[PDB]
Amino acid sequence: VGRYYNPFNIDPLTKKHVEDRLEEFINQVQVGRFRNASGNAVGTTLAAFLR
């Protein structure tokens, strides 16, 4: 009898990620401003890769 961590931080009962706010968090990055005071594609590029 043994135990092992489920890969990729997914709960089988929920069938989703452990964090319940991931969808809200990704949208927050998409509409954020990073690395510049002016507009840039850092927020949008990271959101696309995260999704």
Binding site: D11, L13, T14
Partner: protein
Amino acid sequence: ANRATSAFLDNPHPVGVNYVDEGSRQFVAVAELLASKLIDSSRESDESNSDVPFVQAYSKFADDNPRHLRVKTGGKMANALTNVIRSYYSINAPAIVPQVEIDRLASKATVSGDMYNSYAIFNSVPIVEVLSPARTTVSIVGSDRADVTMLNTGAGAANITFNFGQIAETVILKGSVPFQLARLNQPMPAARFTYKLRPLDGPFIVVLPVGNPLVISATAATRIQVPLAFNKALVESGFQTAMNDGLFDIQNVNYYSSFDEFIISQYHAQDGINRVSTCVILGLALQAYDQMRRALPV
């Protein structure tokens, strides 16, 4: 002659005549099914560290998405359930739930309205009358276990008549000391500690000697048809909650310490069959009320 009667068998009050039709019975059954799933989802959410099972269950029950900064009352179903419970208890209570609302809530699940599929055993001891001659004292105390205290101050032995009614199925008598009991126009057996009697056999005559007090403990079992989802432990919890919540306060109604006493007393009064039919529906509604109130206190 002196007559002794059980306290909870005296003057039953009329019960409600609304919310008895097939659509209404479906509503009570749906409420019981949805309320049970609500309390299971409460446990599952705690174990799985996510609120998804509770949100789905509450949305089905209350027709509203749960939100923070809300009391989580239960929605229209809780209000309908509460007002329907008041209607059953007394004929004086108003019926303020529209029929269209009950049918709409009954469509949230597909269950049968049958309330007589199964049975249940009810433990209240009905002692309709105990007839004693002069120079003797008889006292009856208790409902679940009736103790009858018997004293004979006369010169000789006395015959005392017990009448347990016709509704009860079996009655078990246990005496403090061995005593003598037989039906009318039957020979007296030897002294025995315990007796098993069918109440339909007729009045029972007990011989009381002159020496020391005799106490007889009585236990009875009665069968009443109930739906398969009936749970006596949950019904009792709902009965005490409804009484404490003030759902049973109305003019000219008797008050009982348990649903056991309520249903048995209603049975023994005139037109017994129809009253028990309504009381059984109240039991399922009370069962649903307990689970919804324990999941969503207010």
